[PDB]
Amino acid sequence: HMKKRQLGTSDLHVSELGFGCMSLGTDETKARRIMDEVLELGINYLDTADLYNQGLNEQFVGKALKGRRQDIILATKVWWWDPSKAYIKEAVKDSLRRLQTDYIDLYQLHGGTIDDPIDETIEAFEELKQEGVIRYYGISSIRPNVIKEYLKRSNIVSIMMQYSILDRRPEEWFPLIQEHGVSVVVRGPVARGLLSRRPLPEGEGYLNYRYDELKLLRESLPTDRPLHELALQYCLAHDVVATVAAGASSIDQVKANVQAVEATPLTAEERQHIQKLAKAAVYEQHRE
Ligand SMILES: OC[C@H]1O[C@@](CO)(O[C@H]2O[C@H](CO)[C@@H](O)[C@H](O)[C@H]2O)[C@@H](O)[C@@H]1O
Ligand code: NA
Numbered sequence: 190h191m192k193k194r195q196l197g198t199s200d201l202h203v204s205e206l207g208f209g210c211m212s213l214g215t216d217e218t219k220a221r222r223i224m225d226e227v228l229e230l231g232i233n234y235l236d237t238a239d240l241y242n243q244g245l246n247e248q249f250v251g252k253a254l255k256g257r258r259q260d261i262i263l264a265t266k267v268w269w270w271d272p273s274k275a276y277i278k279e280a281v282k283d284s285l286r287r288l289q290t291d292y293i294d295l296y297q298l299h300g301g302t303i304d305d306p307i308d309e310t311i312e313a314f315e316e317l318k319q320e321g322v323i324r325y326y327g328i329s330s331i332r333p334n335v336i337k338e339y340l341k342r343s344n345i346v347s348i349m350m351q352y353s354i355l356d357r358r359p360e361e362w363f364p365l366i367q368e369h370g371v372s373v374v375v376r377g378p379v380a381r382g383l384l385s386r387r388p389l390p391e392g393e394g395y396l397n398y399r400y401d402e403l404k405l406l407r408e409s410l411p412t413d414r415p416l417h418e419l420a421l422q423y424c425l426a427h428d429v430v431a432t433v434a435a436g437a438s439s440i441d442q443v444k445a446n447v448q449a450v451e452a453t454p455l456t457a458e459e460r461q462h463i464q465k466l467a468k469a470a471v472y473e474q475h476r477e
Contacts, residue, residue, distance in 0.1 A: 190451050191231030194431040197346030198370040199325045201262050201294055205425060206450040207234035207374070207432040208443070210243040217249060224253035226440050228261070230447045234432055237284070238266035238297060238329070240376050241436065247287035254290060263288065264295040266329065272305050277313035281322055295347060296323040303334045303475075311343045318344075327374070332475035333362060340369045347431065351377040354384060354410070354423050355395050355403075357469045363429045372431035375424045379435055384420035397470050409466050411459060418449040423463050426455040 193202040208227050213220035227235075237245040247265075254261055265288075267280040281296055296317065298310065314326040327347030328339055339345050348366060350359045352375045359373065366373060379385050383395050389403050398406070411419060424433050435446045455463075 191233075191447065192451075193233070194372070196262075196295070196325070196374075196431045197327075197372045199295075199346040201325060201346070203234040203262055203432045204232045205432055206232055206421075206446055207236055207264075207434045208232045208437075209236035209238065209245060209434045210240040210436055211245055211438070212243060213246050213249050217252065220246065220249040221253050223440060224250065227443060228253075228257070230443065232443075232447070233260065234262045234264065236264040236295075236297075236374075236434060237288075238264065238299065240434060241381070247284055251288040251290065254288065258290055262294045263290070264297060264327075265293050266297045266299045270300075272310070274309045274313040274316075277310065278317060278322075281317060285322070292321055293323045294325065296326045297347070297349065298326070298328045298330075301328055301330055301335045301339075302332070303338060307338055307342060311339075315344070329376075331358070331472065333472055334475045334477055336362060336366070340365065340371060345371060347372050347374050349374040349376055349434075351375075352424055352430075353378050353380040354420055354463060354467050355380040355398060355406075357467060358472050360427075360469065361471050363427060367429045371429075373427075373429050375430055375433040377436075378424045378433045379417055379420050381436070385417045386415075397468060402468075406467060411462060414452070415449070417445070418452050419455075419459075419463070421446070421449045422452060422455045423460065425450065426460045 191204045193204055196203050213223055237247050237250055265284045267277050317323045325346045327345045329349035330336055331350055336348060350373055352359045392400050394400055395403060421433060424430050437443045437446060
């Protein structure tokens with residue numbers, strides 16, 4: 190019942206819910222148990238990169254892939270900052286060794302800026318792709334100047350962005366991304382718990398929302414779906430979004446995310462109501 194979407198123009202067909210950001214823990218047996226359940230739910234997209242400062246243990250994920258690697262789409266990212274070709278090419282070797290596999294499906298640049306050596310970076314990814322060490326590459330960025338450079342100059346297939354009802358800054362860039370045949374991978378779709386059952390911490394805001402505005406918005410949003418489901422479905426209602434990496438701290442939370450993603454898509458009345466009710470901010474920094 191887990192649907193898939195094409196990632197950009199690539200041959201990667203990713204589950205609409207992806208898995209990432211878990212302390213799979215200290216015990217291998219239980220980590221493998223968690224992974225078996227993730228895959229049983231029809232999730233086929235595993236991103237080992239840190240999201241909100243938690244990644245996936247590559248040694249454990251490697252052991253979970255045993256016997257089924259061909260059916261899983263594996264993503265990773267690229268201490269001493271060294272922005273060279275040689276660094277990008279050497280970093281992926283480490284992940285491959287830990288993962289006990291010989292290719293990565295999607296290799297993603299984190300920490301990019303417009304002052305980086307952009308041709309060198311693109312060349313490193315293209316050389317890895319031509320050699321088959323990776324199948325495709327992408328970036329993780331909320332900087333429009335970085336995004337525009339890689340859309341114009343490279344063959345990225347994906348951009349990972351923080352995106353939710355409460356952070357609609359990405360939407361400005363969706364037409365440009367889609368015109369280039371690129372997809373968005375979403376992080377933070379539940380706004381780190383602000384679009385769930387957890388209390389809004391008193392007095393605290395979120396981006397350009399004050400506390401009182403978060404309270405009013407929770408209450409004014411449609412109530413015929415749980416808020417968590419409305420949040421995930423709002424992200425998915427945009428064709429540019431290929432997959433959402435929602436946070437989880439347990440198998441029960443993964444199962445809740447799966448149930449929400451497999452719910453009925455938003456209609457027009459629903460998506461429009463949300464667009465009108467929620468702020469539509471833009472990025473202030475790194476625009477050009
Ligand atoms: O204030 C003008 C205009 O800005 C919006 C943008 O969403 O609200 C921002 O400004 C308010 C007044 O300073 C803040 O209370 C609010 O937190 C902030 O987002 C609009 O709501 C408002 O019309
Ligand atoms: Na614009």
